[PDB]
Amino acid sequence: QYSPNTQQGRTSIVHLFEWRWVDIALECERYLAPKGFGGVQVSPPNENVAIYNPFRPWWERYQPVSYKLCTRSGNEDEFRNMVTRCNNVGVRIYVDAVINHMCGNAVSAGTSSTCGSYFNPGSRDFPAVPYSGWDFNDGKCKTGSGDIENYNDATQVRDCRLTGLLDLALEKDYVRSKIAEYMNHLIDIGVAGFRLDASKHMWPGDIKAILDKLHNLNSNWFPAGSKPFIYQEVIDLGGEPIKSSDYFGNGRVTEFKYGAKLGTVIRKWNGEKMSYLKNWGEGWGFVPSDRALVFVDNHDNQRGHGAGGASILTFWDARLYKMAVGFMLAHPYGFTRVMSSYRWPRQFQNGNDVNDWVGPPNNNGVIKEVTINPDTTCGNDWVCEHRWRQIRNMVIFRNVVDGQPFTNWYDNGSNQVAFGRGNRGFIVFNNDDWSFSLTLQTGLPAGTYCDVISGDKINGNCTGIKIYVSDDGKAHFSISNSAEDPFIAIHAESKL
């Protein structure tokens, strides 16, 4: 459950948030495969409540109606086709498994669902699964409101309704089998693994009991005996009874400390400086690298009120965001997930965005196609951070430098830092308000290297800055604080 099951030399996955299945499948073939991406995290593929107040919010997809693969992203045929086409070009599919809960208890009974299945939250009846009142935690939850009130009670966090979402009884073999039936259906279709949504709200033993029911991966695309990649969403910044290490036996865990700390450091908040990133990794109190799923932002916290609050960097802070992602992709700690978002009319009142519920770009609730501009950016309000040259090239950087040790660190005691990855790559950062002009040991073979942040290596020449490494491995770097991207990254495959 720790191995991503990616192809050799593909070290990152991208969260194609609210993307349609056919758009993802085409994206696998036209972009993700040639650009070296390892896999894709898909929005929950199972039927959810259609919520019209507010109008089709993104978070409606975390309120399951049933386990039918039938959503605003596509039907089972489109999903099967996406998984097949992606695997055939070497890009994996990881399913956001919403297994902790059904929809909210106060949702109106009826057929207002993405596949028209009937469901009655009031009576705990989901006949499309089927689930009944026996399959929920009404009895086990000891709290007055039936919801999660006190996060310092680990039992209530697990046994009660997350923001009123009906909490399944994962101790029962019947509930474990229906979830495993659903997950095994996705494994048989060919998915490489799962993001376990709201893992903090499930007991680790219940997770283990479910995972033990899972098949090995589809042998058409995976070696015999391959297990599904498991990364569990557990928000743990410390100081709470639930520790993300409690889930190490089931798979990797989302390290929400990663993006929280990295954002504060790069915003230069709270006296933090980039020079403190020298011991980045376990040194900062993070989970072991082999247990870590890392990211700058996720679909939730990029709206400002998730784990890490205002410190989370997003595409809205594009310049600072690119630096954080570049550092993450350059540093060997953890398995990196790149965020790919859509635009929404962010409207702040008292520092709170009242439109952070807005779902993907749509035409009367129908998600818009992802269109590609001639400059390779996206239209139809899709941000496609994964297609940004500065981020995409760093995804490749991580592939090129895979396995090479963190070495050759430099810092100025402030915010001008650099490091290398063995003899395969070097990266330099200037987050101070003055120029970075210095000659640094890169550890790279002598040659002319294309800076993959400001440009590309195309036809034996660079479209951006050129770095000249001498025979001693030294190279001079000159980065203005007014530079569009105040960081430079070179690697073995950007050498002319």
């Binding site: 919010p57 999660i148 009130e149 009242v354």
Partner: peptide, 18 residues
Amino acid sequence: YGHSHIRFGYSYHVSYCG
């Protein structure tokens, strides 16, 4: 319930707190 552990964004939380 409070404002400590917000999930699904601010707008969802405000409607949940009500």
